[PDB]
């Protein structure tokens, strides 16, 4: 049923892109809505072959009502358990949730790091008295491979009449 | 404005105070993630046109996995801007920093979302799954992008910045900025004598900042661009379902209910091909503008590294002047730099000598200009008036008084002799 | 994974280019070789073109991706001719730009298609706990140190240098005396030694 207060000269109604909202039914003469069953992605979280063959579906925006459950802000979750404990994200499931395997699949809210801090007073300071040299490494790209496609050859390949 | 500097040989010009200002910066780091299904928009449901658009090769692959990539790197712009923290620093309980306030950047014990007072101006100052149209949420929600700036400003205000080199090392703030003085040239002694003056001319440029934010029309426009260039390429995408492309109609649904298939696989044709090139456009612009945003989110987090996590002296890139600090304050799709600087102001000329000549032996100063106000020489510091009467400790001796041309004849006091005496 | 991403990409983006060539593109083949002579040409050449238009506008998008993710190379290859010359060639003072730490050296080593680099750093460690002060009023004059901290152990007063502890005795050639001890906010008497 159309909440929507209409007039009675003319029936259809749209709103952006050909896109019919509502409709008047012919023989009741009453104003209807139309909008289609939801449709979504589909994403499958794994924890990888080798560990174990398990997954956990989540589909992508749907009230999970028209398809151990959970409901996330990105969709619904089937096949992990909700824990109170929070870890470092293992797999980014969307919106501040992450998921991981280790009693098959949790899903938890990620920290953001250990919680510390130290003290601070307005005449105390820290001073170190030693040090550790460490080395790291850093990876950059500088080029690709120099292909070369010639566009007749591709597109005709052999014929003159082409 | 027109200026004319006096400029003559001799003749230097040295300021005698200093006016702390703080300058915001905005930077746009992420952008919305949209991911569209290439097939939703050509078909539309539709398994008597789905076999028509297969035989297009894997075109509809491509603009799947394209839009996949420009998502996936829009988690990673924020991850390089804000989580540069190991841990997540908190202020002390008793806010005692010696006069500077810093009441209207920390997060707020108030309504939840705890943003700072600032942060709540920004996030109002700014202010759909239909046909095919997705936005996914971003990894990082606005609750946890306000704990790692509040975790940057929660250290950066209490322990320095040793950040940049590890473990946390506590000092406080009172004899923080008297270490970045000595970066830019000033003696620390400036802050210990001046503090209570230079604590009400920082809290006062804070105090500025959020007037000049909300009674302005637009301060936040390198944020609202992005928006609407997002909303706006989307819309034409939408609208562009309406077009008949040389078909009979424009929708998909009513070609079916008045053709047989063997001549209706031409008129859906139109539409096939005509759609298909009106989502390529879009998909490339799209690949063109994330690589805009991309090099903003690493100059971004270029800002985050230097200027926040210590102090820089590359010139007019953290702020305009001599840089002493930043304070990073988050936004709907972006950050803001609160850079501190110092401009020297209320200058007075003097005439100058490039030496001292003293015992037929030239002097020059350690660190400092030989100045005189038109009877007696000193030395002051470059960059704030300090007058200290010529002394062997604070000169040194090299050269002959016959090379250098510009010497003054004086003396050189020594300390040692009259001691002696 | 930097590097083998890279060799990925343009390994996907030409492996899909070349599965092109068997799409029919709304034609009646996919072979070119079975159009031209199964079929009059006053009716091949309408369902050639089908053909090119199809081929050829699959030819200008690996183009574009190319000419764009050749940006996305470009941008990287200037940070590493700049990270060489800023911080190979020399040391550099910018916080975080050549890894987490103070920047000592690094050394370039070369890769396939791209460079590595060793960034030798200087982490401090084993800090510890101290009393300290602005400055010391000795005299009635004001004494600020010309670099180091007025660390106190909790008795007795020391200069040492602020990223490593060494302590030394407070002279007149560690501190400069400027003022007076009226202004400051937080000076600690001590006498200061002087060495004549
Ligand atoms: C400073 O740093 C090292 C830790 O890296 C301290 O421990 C020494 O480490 C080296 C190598 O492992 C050993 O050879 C020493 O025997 C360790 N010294 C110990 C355990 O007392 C080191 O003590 C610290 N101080 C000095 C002066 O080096
Ligand atoms: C600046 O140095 C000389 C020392 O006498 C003076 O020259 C004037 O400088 C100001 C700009 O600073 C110019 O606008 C004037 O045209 C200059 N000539 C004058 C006033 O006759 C001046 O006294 C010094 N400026 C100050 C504030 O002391
Ligand atoms: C700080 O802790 C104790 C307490 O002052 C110090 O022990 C004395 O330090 C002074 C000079 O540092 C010596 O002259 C004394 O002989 C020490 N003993 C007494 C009873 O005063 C200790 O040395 C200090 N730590 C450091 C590294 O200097
Ligand atoms: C249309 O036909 C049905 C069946 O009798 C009945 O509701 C009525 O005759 C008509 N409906 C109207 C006038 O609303
Ligand atoms: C799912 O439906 C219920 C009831 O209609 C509602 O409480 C909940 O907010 C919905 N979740 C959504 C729209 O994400
Ligand atoms: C988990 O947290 C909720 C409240 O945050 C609490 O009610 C519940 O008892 C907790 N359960 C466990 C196993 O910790
Ligand atoms: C320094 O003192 C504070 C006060 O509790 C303490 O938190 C801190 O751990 C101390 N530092 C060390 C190395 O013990
Ligand atoms: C800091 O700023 C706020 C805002 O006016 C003010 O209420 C407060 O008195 C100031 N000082 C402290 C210690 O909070
Ligand atoms: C530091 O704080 C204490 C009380 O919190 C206060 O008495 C003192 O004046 C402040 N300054 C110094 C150098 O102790």
């Not at chain 1, 028209?66 to 619904?76: D, L, S």
């Not at chain 2, 506590?170 to 209570?196: C, D, H, S, W």
């Not at chain 2, 936040?220 to 992005?226: A, S």
């Not at chain 2, 106000?373 to 704030?384: A, E, L």
């Amino acid at each position: 049923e159309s909440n929507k207060k209409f007039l009675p000269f003319q029936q259809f109604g749209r709103d952006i892109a050909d896109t019919t909202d509502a409709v008047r039914d012919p023989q009741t003469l009453e104003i209807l809505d139309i909008t289609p069953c939801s449709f979504g992605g589909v994403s499958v979280i794994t924890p990888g072959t080798n560990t174990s063959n398990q997954v956990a579906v989540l589909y992508q925006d749907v009230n999970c009502t028209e398809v151990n459950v959970f409901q996330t802000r990105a969709g619904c979750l089937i096949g992990a358990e909700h824990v109170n404990n929070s870890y470092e994200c293992d797999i980014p499931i969307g919106a501040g949730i992450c998921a991981s395997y280790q009693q098959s699949i949790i899903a938890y809210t990620m920290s953001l790091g250990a919680e510390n801090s130290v003290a601070y007073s307005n005449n105390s300071i820290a001073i170190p008295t030693n040090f550790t040299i460490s080395v790291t490494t850093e990876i950059l790209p500088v080029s690709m491979t120099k292909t070369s496609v010639d566009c007749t050859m591709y597109i005709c390949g052999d014929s003159t009449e082409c | 404005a027109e200026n004319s500097v006096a400029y003559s040989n001799n003749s230097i010009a040295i300021p005698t105070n200093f006016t702390i200002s703080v300058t915001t910066e905005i930077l746009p780091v992420s952008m919305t993630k949209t991911s569209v299904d290439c097939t939703m928009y050509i078909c539309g449901d539709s398994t008597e046109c789905s076999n028509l658009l297969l035989q297009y090769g894997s075109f509809c692959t491509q603009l799947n996995r394209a839009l996949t990539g420009i998502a996936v790197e829009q988690d990673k712009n924020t991850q390089e801007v804000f989580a540069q923290v190991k841990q997540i620093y908190k202020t002390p309980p008793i806010k005692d920093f010696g006069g500077f306030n810093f009441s209207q950047i920390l997060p707020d014990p108030s309504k939840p979302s705890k943003r700072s007072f600032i942060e709540d101006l920004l996030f109002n100052k700014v202010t759909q799954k239909f046909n095919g149209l997705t936005v996914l949420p971003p990894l990082l929600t606005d609750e946890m992008i306000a704990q790692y700036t509040s975790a940057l400003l929660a250290g950066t205000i209490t322990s320095g910045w040793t950040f940049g080199a590890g473990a946390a090392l506590q000092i406080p703030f009172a004899m923080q900025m008297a270490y970045r003085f000595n970066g830019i040239g000033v003696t620390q002694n400036v802050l210990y004598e001046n503090q209570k003056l230079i604590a009400n001319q920082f809290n006062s440029a804070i105090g500025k900042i959020q007037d000049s934010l909300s009674s302005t029309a637009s301060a936040l426009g390198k944020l609202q661009d992005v928006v609407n260039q997002n909303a706006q390429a989307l819309n034409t995408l939408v609208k562009q379902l309406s077009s008949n492309f040389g078909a009979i109609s424009s929708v998909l649904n009513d070609i079916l209910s008045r053709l047989d298939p063997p001549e209706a696989e031409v008129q859906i044709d139109r539409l096939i091909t005509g759609r298909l090139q009106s989502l390529q456009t879009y998909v490339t612009q799209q690949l063109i503008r994330a690589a805009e945003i991309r090099a903003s989110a690493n100059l971004a987090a270029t800002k985050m590294s230097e200027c926040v996590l210590g102090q820089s002296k590359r010139v007019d890139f953290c702020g305009k002047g001599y840089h002493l600090m930043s304070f990073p304050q988050s936004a709907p799709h972006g950050v803001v730099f609160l850079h501190v600087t110092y401009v020297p102001a209320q200058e007075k000329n003097f005439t100058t000598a490039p030496a001292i000549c003293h015992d037929g032996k030239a002097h020059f100063p350690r660190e400092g200009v030989f100045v005189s106000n038109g009877t007696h020489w000193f030395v002051t510091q470059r960059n704030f008036y300090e007058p200290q009467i010529i002394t062997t400790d604070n000169t040194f001796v090299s050269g002959n008084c016959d090379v250098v041309i510009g010497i003054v004849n004086n003396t050189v006091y020594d300390p040692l002799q009259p001691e002696l005496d």
